[PDB]
Ligand binder design. Structure first.
Ligand SMILES: *CCC[n+]1cc(CCCCCCCCCCCC)n([C@H]2O[C@H](COP(=O)(O)OP(=O)(O)OC[C@H]3O[C@@H](n4cnc5c(N)ncnc54)[C@H](O)[C@@H]3O)[C@@H](O)[C@H]2O)n1
Ligand SMILES: [Zn+2]
Lengths: 287, 8
């Protein structure tokens, strides 16, 4: 075992050693809840328990491509509803920023579509936006694919006018991977190389229930330590083994992502760095 | 045929 204690402090000591050179982050909606964007499956606060106004066969249809092509109005209504007043990345986003600035971040695979990793300062080469982004949008006709900027999408969404392509009159969809859509080729290109060389998996804010993203946790070498920072355990059957008498490399820290990243940063000696980074960047944003 | 799709 590469960790000497299955605790946050043992992970921090490992990250300070010279074996730990390449860290992969796998992040989900949980790392953005403290920024105002709700997640999907948390009780009462999650989106899946706020979708009766839209009458749906299943709650996930509002994010499924065939239902969208037949009934796009619920999705764009939810879009106008949830569009935040501000886009401020969280302590966890800036913790990943610090991993980048210190040459430790091999890649961040994200399920989020809010572009907060980008705003935190993670560049395209650092990111695998496995499920796309809300930032750009395209006509759904594969022979047209006319692109439209977020400003046009916002005018059409807030005017409550279903977006249509000025060439086909076809539907215009934000560049999100809906259920039943193929993941980008970059995902499968990065996956083949990244998980042969990874020294640490950092999983944060995800229930690990959407495929093939979740299978990423099992692509690492069997000696690679894996730290979950999440309000609840996830990824248990590869497969996260936290509790068993055979456990040897998986550590779970149950709590807020922001609190766990503060704690890990302090254990690393990066506490003041992270605090100043968050202040300076939230200031440049609030301007 | 296509690349693997998003699945629950
Ligand atoms: C195959 C493709 C399936 N697919 C597509 C999408 C994208 C849908 C985008 C919808 C956008 C609509 C407009 C919104 C505009 C917003 C402004 C721009 N998805 C998405 O669904 C999946 C969600 O999975 P997840 O793992 O990311 O999230 P869950 O809600 O299931 O689990 C969250 C997890 O975190 C814990 N938690 C919550 N809050 C926490 C804090 N503060 N600290 C720690 N832990 C926290 C919860 O307990 C839970 O375990 C993704 O695939 C996403 O892409 N799917
Ligand atoms: Zn078109």
């Amino acid at each position: 075992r590469l960790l000497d204690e299955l605790t946050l402090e043992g992970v921090a000591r490992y990250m300070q050693s010279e074996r730990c050179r390449r860290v992969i982050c796998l992040v989900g909606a949980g790392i953005s809840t403290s920024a105002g964007i709700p997640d999907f499956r948390s009780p009462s606060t999650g989106l899946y328990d706020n979708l009766e106004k839209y009458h749906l066969p299943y709650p996930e249809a509002i994010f499924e491509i065939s239902y969208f092509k037949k009934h796009p109005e619920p999705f764009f209504a939810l879009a106008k509803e949830l569009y935040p007043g501000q886009f401020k990345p969280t302590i966890c986003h800036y913790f990943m920023r610090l991993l980048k600035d210190k040459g430790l971040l091999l890649r961040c695979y994200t399920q989020n579509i809010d572009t907060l990793e980008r705003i935190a300062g993670l560049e395209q080469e650092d990111l695998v936006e496995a499920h796309g982004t809300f930032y750009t949008s395209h006509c759904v006709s594969a022979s047209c694919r006319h692109e439209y900027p977020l400003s046009w999408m916002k005018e059409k969404i807030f005017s409550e006018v279903t977006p249509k392509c000025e060439d086909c009159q076809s539907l215009v969809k934000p560049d999100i991977v809906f259920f039943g859509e193929s993941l980008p080729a970059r995902f499968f290109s990065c996956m083949q190389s990244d998980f042969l060389k990874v020294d640490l998996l950092l999983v944060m804010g995800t229930s690990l229930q959407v495929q093939p993203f979740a299978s990423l946790i099992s692509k690492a070498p069997l000696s690679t330590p894996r730290l979950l920072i999440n309000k609840e355990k996830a990824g248990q059957s590869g497969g996260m083994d936290f509790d068993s008498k055979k456990a040897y490399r998986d550590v779970a820290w149950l709590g807020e992502c922001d609190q766990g990243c503060l704690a890990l940063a302090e254990l690393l000696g990066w506490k003041k760095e992270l605090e100043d980074l968050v202040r300076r960047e939230h200031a440049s944003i609030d301007a | 045929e296509a690349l693997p799709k998003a699945t629950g």
